[PDB]
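cache lookup: miss for this entity combination. No prior model stored, computing from scratch. Input as submitted by user K.M.:
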Amino acid sequence: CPLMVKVLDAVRGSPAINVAVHVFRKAADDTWEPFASGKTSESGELHGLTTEEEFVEGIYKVEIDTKSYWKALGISPFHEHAEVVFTANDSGPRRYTIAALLSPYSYSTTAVVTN
Amino acid sequence: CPLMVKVLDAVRGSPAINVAVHVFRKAADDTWEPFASGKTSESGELHGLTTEEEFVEGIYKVEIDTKSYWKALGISPFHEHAEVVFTANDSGPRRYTIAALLSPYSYSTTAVVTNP
Amino acid sequence: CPLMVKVLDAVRGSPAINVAVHVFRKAADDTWEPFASGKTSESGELHGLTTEEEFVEGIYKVEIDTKSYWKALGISPFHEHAEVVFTANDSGPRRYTIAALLSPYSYSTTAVVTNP
Amino acid sequence: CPLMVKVLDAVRGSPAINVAVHVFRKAADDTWEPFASGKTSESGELHGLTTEEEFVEGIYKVEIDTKSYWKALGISPFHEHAEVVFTANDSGPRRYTIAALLSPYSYSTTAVVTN
């Protein structure tokens, strides 16, 4: 599993469950092409997005659908979504976890890149 | 001043100076149209991007060029840029401060929105 | 103004107003001695805590009363308070801004330190 | 395992390994008494701090020794340590993860409290 996403809710102190996540890869015409997507599990994680064979070097974008997540909790959010854009590199460590911590008007995202 | 951007460096504990920032507005046709751009100052702030008149309702995207920033300090960072995407002015004009706090493999962004 | 505190509410996207803040300085004897205190204003800022003269080298602790804050808005938060502990002025006088960004079960704190 | 700590390094994009963590419980004379301590593992985690029997309701403080961690990387830090202070409650969910994300001049901490 080369690319995993983990999302937390800073308001409830809990995983952010059932959050839609869409990943895109930049194509040679500079557009974003759908690459992988899913919904975070009960532990706030999304696994099984891609495989080592398919996850080649390139520029990827991970879009986390935060606004629908907050609307379903009845809390007015600021952002349309949270967006993480990065270059995957074979010289780096082999596994990428994109973590995100969500509040209605604020989020952080951290990449944890390991062996 | 309805839209301002403030950027901090979490490594040095200082403003992030000379950070390029590009703002786009989602078009009628669904594309991102260029809306305004500038660089942060010595205080890590970017003012004067737009006017209440020009800054109408819409979906806006504030792209902060964090990669050039880290690279010019000798660091190879994770993200290409930070992107902040939000609907603005849909309940009337507001003043928006988009803050970002940067580290090489992490950032956070916070909006402070006040009723002018 | 060598020491200032700024507090934001990540839920509402606004300054956190009326947040009580207590500052302590580590004593000669190792205890935390009361150093200064105040409440954030309408802009979520606390100024005038100390003076360059009084603010000497030492280890300081800035305690931000985040629990009273959330509770007065009907939220039962995780933390009793946020505590920020740092050595100050050990390479000469500096100006310190202690920023905090609050959510019910999370906060972050950032120092911006500049050479006056 | 009722209380776990997980620490990440925002500068290197990695778990924060070998970070000392000390936990204290507030005693009836208002002092902090040592309760549990350890060093984060290679995955940035610390487990086995306490047991459900011993972790009773009370006010606890978790001190994460960030300053020594940054000094060992040769990076000048701001804080002496990061401190998380909270009341454990039996009405809450039964497991507490104190997560912390560290930079030299900034840190965040989040409690993820689950079943």
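stored under new cache key. The first helix of chain A runs from residue 66 to 72.
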